[PDB]
Amino acid sequence: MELLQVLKRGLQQVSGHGGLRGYLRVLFRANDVRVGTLVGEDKYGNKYYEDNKQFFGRHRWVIYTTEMNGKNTFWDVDGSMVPPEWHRWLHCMTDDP
Amino acid sequence: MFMINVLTLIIPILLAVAFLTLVERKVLGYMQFRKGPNVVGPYGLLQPIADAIKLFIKEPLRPATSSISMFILAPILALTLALTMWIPLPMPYPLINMNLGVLFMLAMSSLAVYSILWSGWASNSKYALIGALRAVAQTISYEVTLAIILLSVLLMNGSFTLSTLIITQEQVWLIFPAWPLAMMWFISTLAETNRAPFDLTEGESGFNVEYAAGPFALFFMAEYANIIMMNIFTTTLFLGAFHNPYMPELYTINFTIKSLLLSITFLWIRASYPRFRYDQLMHLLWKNFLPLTLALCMWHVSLPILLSSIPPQT
Amino acid sequence: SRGEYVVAKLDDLINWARRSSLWPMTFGLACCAVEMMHMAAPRYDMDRFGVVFRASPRQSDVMIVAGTLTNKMAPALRKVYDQMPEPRYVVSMGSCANGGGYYHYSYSVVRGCDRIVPVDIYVPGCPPTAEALLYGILQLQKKIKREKRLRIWYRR
Amino acid sequence: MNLMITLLTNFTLATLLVTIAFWLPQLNVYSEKTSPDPMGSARLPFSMKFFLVAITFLLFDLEIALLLPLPWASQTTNLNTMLTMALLLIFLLAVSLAYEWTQKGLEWTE
Amino acid sequence: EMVRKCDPHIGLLHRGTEKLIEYKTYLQALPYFDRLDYVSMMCNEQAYSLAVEKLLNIQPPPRAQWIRVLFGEITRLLNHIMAVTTHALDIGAMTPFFWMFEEREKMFEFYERVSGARMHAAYVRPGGVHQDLPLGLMDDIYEFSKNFSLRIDELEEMLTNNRIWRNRTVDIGVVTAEDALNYGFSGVMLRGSGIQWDLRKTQPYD
Amino acid sequence: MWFEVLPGIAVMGVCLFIPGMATARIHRFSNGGREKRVAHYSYQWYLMERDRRVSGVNRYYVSKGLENID
Amino acid sequence: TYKYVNLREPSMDMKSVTDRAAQTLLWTELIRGLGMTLSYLFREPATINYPFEKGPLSPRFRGEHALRRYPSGEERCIACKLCEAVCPAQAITIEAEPRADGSRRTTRYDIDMTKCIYCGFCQEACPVDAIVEGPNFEFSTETHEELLYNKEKLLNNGDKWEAEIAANIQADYLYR
Amino acid sequence: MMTYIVFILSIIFVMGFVGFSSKPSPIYGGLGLIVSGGVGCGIVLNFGGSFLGLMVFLIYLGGMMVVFGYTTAMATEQYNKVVLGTFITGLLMEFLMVYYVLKDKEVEIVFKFNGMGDWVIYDTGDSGFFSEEAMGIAALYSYGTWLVIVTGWSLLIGVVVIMEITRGN
Amino acid sequence: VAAFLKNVWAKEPVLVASFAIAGLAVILPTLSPYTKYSLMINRATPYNYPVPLRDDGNMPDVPSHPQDPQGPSLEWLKRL
Numbered sequence A: 001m002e003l004l005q006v007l008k009r010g011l012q013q014v015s016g017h018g019g020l021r022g023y024l025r026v027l028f029r030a031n032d033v034r035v036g037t038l039v040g041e042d043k044y045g046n047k048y049y050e051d052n053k054q055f056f057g058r059h060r061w062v063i064y065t066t067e068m069n070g071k072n073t074f075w076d077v078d079g080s081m082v083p084p085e086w087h088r089w090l091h092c093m094t095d096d097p
Numbered sequence B: 001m002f003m004i005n006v007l008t009l010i011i012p013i014l015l016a017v018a019f020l021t022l023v024e025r026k027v028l029g030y031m032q033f034r035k036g037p038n039v040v041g042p043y044g045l046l047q048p049i050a051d052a053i054k055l056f057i058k059e060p061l062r063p064a065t066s067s068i069s070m071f072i073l074a075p076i077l078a079l080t081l082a083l084t085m086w087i088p089l090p091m092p093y094p095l096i097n098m099n100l101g102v103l104f105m106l107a108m109s110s111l112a113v114y115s116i117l118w119s120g121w122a123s124n125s126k127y128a129l130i131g132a133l134r135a136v137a138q139t140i141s142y143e144v145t146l147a148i149i150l151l152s153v154l155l156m157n158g159s160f161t162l163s164t165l166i167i168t169q170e171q172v173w174l175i176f177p178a179w180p181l182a183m184m185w186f187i188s189t190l191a192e193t194n195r196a197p198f199d200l201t202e203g204e205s206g207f208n209v210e211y212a213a214g215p216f217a218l219f220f221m222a223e224y225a226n227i228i229m230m231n232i233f234t235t236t237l238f239l240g241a242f243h244n245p246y247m248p249e250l251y252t253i254n255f256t257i258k259s260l261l262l263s264i265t266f267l268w269i270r271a272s273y274p275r276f277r278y279d280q281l282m283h284l285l286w287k288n289f290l291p292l293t294l295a296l297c298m299w300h301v302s303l304p305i306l307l308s309s310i311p312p313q314t
Numbered sequence C: 001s002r003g004e005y006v007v008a009k010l011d012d013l014i015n016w017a018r019r020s021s022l023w024p025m026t027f028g029l030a031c032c033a034v035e036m037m038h039m040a041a042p043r044y045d046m047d048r049f050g051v052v053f054r055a056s057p058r059q060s061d062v063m064i065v066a067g068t069l070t071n072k073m074a075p076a077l078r079k080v081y082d083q084m085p086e087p088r089y090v091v092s093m094g095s096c097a098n099g100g101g102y103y104h105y106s107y108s109v110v111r112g113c114d115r116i117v118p119v120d121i122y123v124p125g126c127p128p129t130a131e132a133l134l135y136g137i138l139q140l141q142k143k144i145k146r147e148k149r150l151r152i153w154y155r156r
Numbered sequence D: 001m002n003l004m005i006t007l008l009t010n011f012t013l014a015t016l017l018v019t020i021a022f023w024l025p026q027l028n029v030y031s032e033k034t035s036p037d038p039m040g041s042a043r044l045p046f047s048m049k050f051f052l053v054a055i056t057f058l059l060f061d062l063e064i065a066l067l068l069p070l071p072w073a074s075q076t077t078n079l080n081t082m083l084t085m086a087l088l089l090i091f092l093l094a095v096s097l098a099y100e101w102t103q104k105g106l107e108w109t110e
Numbered sequence E: 001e002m003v004r005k006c007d008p009h010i011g012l013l014h015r016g017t018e019k020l021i022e023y024k025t026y027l028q029a030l031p032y033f034d035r036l037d038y039v040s041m042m043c044n045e046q047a048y049s050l051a052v053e054k055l056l057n058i059q060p061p062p063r064a065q066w067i068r069v070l071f072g073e074i075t076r077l078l079n080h081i082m083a084v085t086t087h088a089l090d091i092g093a094m095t096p097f098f099w100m101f102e103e104r105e106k107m108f109e110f111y112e113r114v115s116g117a118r119m120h121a122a123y124v125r126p127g128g129v130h131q132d133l134p135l136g137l138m139d140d141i142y143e144f145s146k147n148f149s150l151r152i153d154e155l156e157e158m159l160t161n162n163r164i165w166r167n168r169t170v171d172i173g174v175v176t177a178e179d180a181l182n183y184g185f186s187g188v189m190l191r192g193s194g195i196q197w198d199l200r201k202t203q204p205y206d
Numbered sequence F: 001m002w003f004e005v006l007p008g009i010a011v012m013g014v015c016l017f018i019p020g021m022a023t024a025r026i027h028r029f030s031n032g033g034r035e036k037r038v039a040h041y042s043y044q045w046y047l048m049e050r051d052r053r054v055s056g057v058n059r060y061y062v063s064k065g066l067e068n069i070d
Numbered sequence G: 001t002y003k004y005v006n007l008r009e010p011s012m013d014m015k016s017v018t019d020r021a022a023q024t025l026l027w028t029e030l031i032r033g034l035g036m037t038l039s040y041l042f043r044e045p046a047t048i049n050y051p052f053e054k055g056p057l058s059p060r061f062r063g064e065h066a067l068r069r070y071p072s073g074e075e076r077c078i079a080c081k082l083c084e085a086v087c088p089a090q091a092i093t094i095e096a097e098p099r100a101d102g103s104r105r106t107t108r109y110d111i112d113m114t115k116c117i118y119c120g121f122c123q124e125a126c127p128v129d130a131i132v133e134g135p136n137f138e139f140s141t142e143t144h145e146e147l148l149y150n151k152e153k154l155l156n157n158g159d160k161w162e163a164e165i166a167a168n169i170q171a172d173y174l175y176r
Numbered sequence H: 001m002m003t004y005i006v007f008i009l010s011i012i013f014v015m016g017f018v019g020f021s022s023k024p025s026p027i028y029g030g031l032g033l034i035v036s037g038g039v040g041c042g043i044v045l046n047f048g049g050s051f052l053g054l055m056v057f058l059i060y061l062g063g064m065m066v067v068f069g070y071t072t073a074m075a076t077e078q079y080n081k082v083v084l085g086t087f088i089t090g091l092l093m094e095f096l097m098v099y100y101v102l103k104d105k106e107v108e109i110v111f112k113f114n115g116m117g118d119w120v121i122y123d124t125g126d127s128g129f130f131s132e133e134a135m136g137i138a139a140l141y142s143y144g145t146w147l148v149i150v151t152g153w154s155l156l157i158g159v160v161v162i163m164e165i166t167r168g169n
Numbered sequence I: 001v002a003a004f005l006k007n008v009w010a011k012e013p014v015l016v017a018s019f020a021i022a023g024l025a026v027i028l029p030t031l032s033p034y035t036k037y038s039l040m041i042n043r044a045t046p047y048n049y050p051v052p053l054r055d056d057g058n059m060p061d062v063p064s065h066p067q068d069p070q071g072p073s074l075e076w077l078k079r080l
């Protein structure tokens, strides 16, 4: 049956975040748990991931850093926390990071 | 020892009401091509707690009520009648085994409109009073068909006892010989609890416009408890489950699943159709539901005589 | 001491409850109301933040002024604002509500909704995108989070 | 015995919840509000339609009270008489509904 | 229950657009026409551009005309989506509002890709259009229009054959043809009474 | 996707399973490992009171059989 | 050239009559609507995870205003006052004087972000590409006075967003 | 004091009757009558009449006093010494009667009443496998043919009469 | 008479169904052969005690024991 593929994909989602601690961390921070290819990261610590199999809009995302310019951003993430060189890539204005 | 039974009846009702609010929000979201709350907690599991605390620290309206007595008394009656309509429900053993539990439920449901009447009269707004009068008229007019349908269904049971209703459906479901009564009963219970497409008070003043946020939450919680109770009653009436006297958990799990499916069908109904007009639902009741209910009542009186299938009195 | 810790934790609890269940009312005046409707669309999904769609004025928390506030409409806006229960917040959407916008020098347009009601968050744009109004709502949530009501009550 | 204990428990839980819902924001000291229906001071217009549907409900409720003991009454030995009386009662219900129907009783609230 | 008199009091959004137009030039007065009907932006821009081009005795190039007609039809799709879904939302059906507002967001993406603004494009100007279409836009337009037939079919499935929906609309607001003509009605209000009139067919533009 | 409504439905299902299970367990515990006896008519109540009087413990669920007769 | 919506006569034979009456009594089209809403339940929703996921945009997007510089440190604005002349909302105030080395530079350049309608006429009336409408849109403020930009704020915005504004201009300048 | 439960309920019944019979306002009279009807249904239930008490709840309170309060809401537009005076004096005669009953365990006003608890009059036997009141009510379709006929005709005639007199023509 | 039924079944099917169900309910119990079974099932239910009769000497029909052959029989109920 084809439910086992879905359960196995959920288990690789648990394992791909480096264990249950990282899984719970990303679940309670980003409200999402799916894994994608790490496109890169910037000077402040934001990590940019992509997944081209998702539909247009979810195929690029950013996990924000926990400390930017001396401010604790573990729960207080901001949309204006992305530097411009990655701001152009994240908003799908270009194909090149 | 009995107070433990009372408490374990009445506290999960409030818990199920709060999670019914969460489930309805999420199911409507996923049915409208979006998501429900998933930010406040893991898949929105903390949304009812936050919403309850916010509503219980909100500023009161402090109205110029004509009567503070019935202004107090209307949520009292609403909550008491929402909680007291669970005690003869067999799960598979009722908390209070009543010989006439069905008619006791009918009496409580008929008594439930005084909350609407007193909430409408206590508020000084005349448009609120007019909305309350219209809601009361719709409620009693659907009480009529509730009573006729229940009377005609009970002729296959033989008594008013709710526990015998499991014994009757030991062979087959009661929706097989009484499906038109089942459809009319479902629509009448949908219009009984003031739900879409019959929730006219949300369409263009409610009966509780001047009520504070806390008492408004109490009224809404009573309404949701009424919804869950009615769906459990419908499941017991028409979709009776297999009850092993040595394992009651089988019946508990089975009717829990069926009643949850019926309540999800309520939420499914509420997001598919436009609302009725007032005269349109009055036409649907007095000119469509009532004659067929009377015809099926005569049919279900005269049928067990001609089939030699009178159910036992005891 | 113990009392400061207790009031700090209680303040965090009540601020979490208030900021995570913001029920908005929307003044559907002009273009910016169509953009508000587009933020309530499936793509941005205002409901998933605990922010319901079109709550009643008698039970809402945040009031959104999306459009132009004319002279014929301002007393009605003040009357609606006065009936809201506390804690009440106001978000100004678009240039017409911010400072008048295109019709600033008109004879029948109030130059900003801050001349009638107190305003907490100003969302710039004409119209500001659904992303921008969502950012303004989340910034309002951040503003509610860092409130210090119980600490102020304890210190006074 | 247990029933009135449960009734008292439900009543006191409801009144406890209502008391906490009322008097807890009373401990807040928010503000004092002056506040100086679409109709301003119009009298409630008396409508014969709502009274008519109320009285029709009351009369049908009375004939429902008459119809209620049918499950017990079906166990009688005199089955022909009980069947005839039951059919006559529901036929009188139908006739009253038809008389309300034909003489425009169910009009504008159909 | 029966309405005897209806008095619609308006003027709550009278901004005074015409005086401000009189105080500015034509290019400055174009966004005033952008903001007049805030669900039919490019149609109002096209009407203003057509009037100014008529007074200027000039005509736009053919590609600008085809772009104008294509975006006028996209604007018509946006307006009809908004009108039907808000009508159903006011009556009480709420699912098609979200269902078609997703496609509305897609059309807004087309507007933003061609002009830089989602709603008030200020794109159609006297003399043609401000900027050419970027490469790869018409493929996305083709895909969207390819799926929009099924979107209309699903809205029609939810709304048209429902008895509750048609009970609110079958005999409501019947207008005779002569009264529709005398009261100054136009468009769908004229066409619903049987009057065969259409400005794109009788007095055509570009 | 759609399977995220399932935690809320599961919590509701637990809260609806709780009262029936608690009622059945309380009835079985309080009545000596048997069902709560139904007394809808006065004959069944008379049997109840006779069994309570014959128990010798003033307790209607302590049922004595052939060990009592001579 | 025209078509007749809703001019279909109903058939009066027994087949059509019984079909319509069965549809009335058994509620067929209501089941159709229920079933299709159920089918729409089991689809993946179109919701993106803001702020971790952003909606798509274009290099022509008109957001926050900025003042650019030449690739030598010198600012591009030469105080020609075309942007304040073309501004349909009169949101731009410009005052100029010759500076120390005799260059024609502004001494005051204010843009009222509460008057501006974000129409992009200023960035297309500029002969030197000095004023631009950058791609930033998340700049909501808690105060009215924070939305009254002077020259220093706009120059800081340009220095902040140059690495994106220059790329957008490079991508779009062949369409102008 | 638990053996006097029906007596205490009767005291509450007559006290509610004094309260609503003072006529403070029609809506408050309706509320007092609803409370008195509930207490009287409690009296009937404690006497053994489950069906008749549930008829009182279903028809008198849930079906008819709703109509009374519904008509009261359509008149008597929303916003004394006499009301308080008669309430006080009715409470005084009621409690004087209670004291004279319980002090001497006998009383005479018009008939002679006894002050013992009302559990004494009950029957010491069982009814078998049925309830007596349910069989008595159920005999309406088998024995009360004439009663059914006259009651149904009176109900239909009442429908006709109400439709006749509210028309105005 | 024939087209009237078709017209009223095309126009008000709910009333046609109601009247048809009513007619079935009022003419079927007088036509079914199982009504007598309901009669003698209801009359053969032993609610109260079968009080014995004092044996004067002439009752051949009345049994002296429940298992005696004479007396009423419910084999028809056991088979049906």
Ligand SMILES: CCCCCCCCCCCCCCCCCC(=O)OC[C@H](COP(=O)([O-])OCC[N+](C)(C)C)OC(=O)CCCCCCCCCCCCCCCCC
Pocket: B180, B182, B183, B184, B186, B187, B197, B234, B238, B269, B273, B284, B288, B289, B292, E163, G024, G025, G026, G027, G030, G031, I011, I012, I014, I016, I017, I020, I021, I024
């Ligand atoms: C509990 C189990 C599940 C129950 C169903 C739950 C899922 C389905 C939910 C459906 C949608 C609910 C929301 C909308 C509710 C409001 C609309 C509505 O219900 O309207 C009812 C509609 C209203 O009818 P109407 O308004 O369309 O009627 C037209 C009337 N005129 C022309 C005057 C305007 O239908 C009914 O009232 C019919 C009720 C059921 C009838 C059952 C008949 C059974 C068959 C009898 C025999 C037929 C053969 C002929 C005789 C043979 C004799 C031998």
Ligand SMILES: CCCCCCCCCCCCCCCCCC(=O)OC[C@H](COP(=O)(O)OCCN)OC(=O)CCCCCCCCCCCCCCCCC
Pocket: A028, A074, B015, B041, B042, B045, B046, F011, F014, F015
């Ligand atoms: C019948 C069953 C009914 C079930 C009902 C409830 C269903 C949902 C259950 C809970 C689901 C998970 C909730 C998780 C909440 C968040 C927990 C958490 O980690 O909070 C962290 C937050 C900040 O922590 P901080 O120390 O600041 O972080 C810096 C470290 N890097 O710290 C804080 O915010 C402070 C601590 C918060 C702890 C919250 C724990 C959960 C509360 C749930 C309440 C209801 C529990 C069930 C009640 C009924 C059953 C007994």
Ligand SMILES: CCCCCCCCCCCCCCCCCC(=O)OC[C@H](COP(=O)(O)OCCN)OC(=O)CCCCCCCCCCCCCCCCC
Pocket: A028, A029, A030, A075, A076, A077, B039, B040, B046, B048, B049, B050, B052, B053, C006, C009, C010, C012, C013, C016
């Ligand atoms: C004497 C000492 C005690 C004094 C009284 C205090 C009692 C305990 C009160 C709760 C705990 C205190 C701390 C409250 C939260 C503070 C930390 C915080 O803000 O955490 C934020 C975090 C979510 O972060 P967020 O900013 O929402 O980010 C969105 C994602 N980008 O939030 C989370 O992860 C979830 C936070 C959950 C908070 C706890 C659970 C709710 C409250 C449960 C108890 C009260 C209600 C019980 C039920 C009532 C009936 C419904």
Ligand SMILES: CCCCCCCCCCCCCCCCCC(=O)OC[C@H](COP(=O)(O)OCCN)OC(=O)CCCCCCCCCCCCCCCCC
Pocket: B073, B076, B077, B080, B081, B084, B097, B098, B099, B100, B101, B104, D001, D003, D004, D007, D011, F039, F040, F041, H034, H035, H037, H038, H039, H041, H042, H043, H045, H046, H050, H053, H054
């Ligand atoms: C504004 C005022 C306050 C408003 C809110 C509170 C009141 C309204 C909401 C609660 C309503 C409670 C209704 C109680 C009566 C319902 C009928 C009833 O008791 O039925 C159960 C049972 C009869 O069934 P049965 O199985 O035959 O009995 C056992 C036989 N072996 O009967 C029994 O088991 C009988 C048990 C002994 C007698 C119990 C008497 C109860 C107390 C009197 C009524 C209390 C309510 C008074 C107020 C009414 C509303 C104003």
Ligand SMILES: CCCCCCCCCCCCCCCCCC(=O)OC[C@H](COP(=O)(O)OCCN)OC(=O)CCCCCCCCCCCCCCCCC
Pocket: B291, B292, B294, B295, D091, D094, D095, D097, D098, D101, I008, I012, I015, I016, I017, I018, I019, I020, I022, I023, I026
């Ligand atoms: C004798 C059997 C037992 C009788 C007693 C039990 C009856 C049970 C059902 C009770 C129904 C009560 C209400 C009846 C009202 C009938 C009158 C009526 O409504 O007439 C008006 C209606 C035309 O409608 P209109 O005038 O427009 O009103 C607005 C709604 N459209 O007019 C119509 O639609 C036409 C209605 C009359 C013709 C109906 C014919 C049905 C035939 C079915 C097959 C035969 C069944 C066997 C019985 C013989 C019937 C003649």
Ligand SMILES: CCCCCCCCCCC1=C(C)C(=O)C(OC)=C(OC)C1=O
Pocket: B014, B017, B018, B021, B022, B025, B047, B048, B051, B052, B055, B216, B217, B220, B221
């Ligand atoms: C003992 C008290 C328990 C908490 C009170 C009941 C649960 C809270 C309901 C709040 C609520 C929610 C979540 C809600 O989503 C909603 O919108 C439909 C409401 O009505 C406007 C509500 O009242």
Ligand code: SF4
Pocket: C030, C031, C032, C066, C067, C068, C093, C094, C095, C096, C097, C101, C102, C125, C126, C127, C128, E035, G117
């Ligand atoms: S700010 Fe712009 S988009 Fe918003 S209402 Fe004003 S003119 Fe319309």
Ligand code: SF4
Pocket: G083, G086, G087, G088, G089, G090, G091, G092, G111, G115, G116, G117, G118, G119, G120, G121, G122, G123
């Ligand atoms: S975008 Fe338009 S309104 Fe804004 S400053 Fe530039 S020219 Fe003026």
Ligand code: SF4
Pocket: G076, G077, G078, G079, G080, G081, G082, G083, G084, G094, G122, G125, G126, G127, G128, G129, G130, G131
């Ligand atoms: S148009 Fe350009 S160069 Fe001229 S004043 Fe404006 S910003 Fe400066």
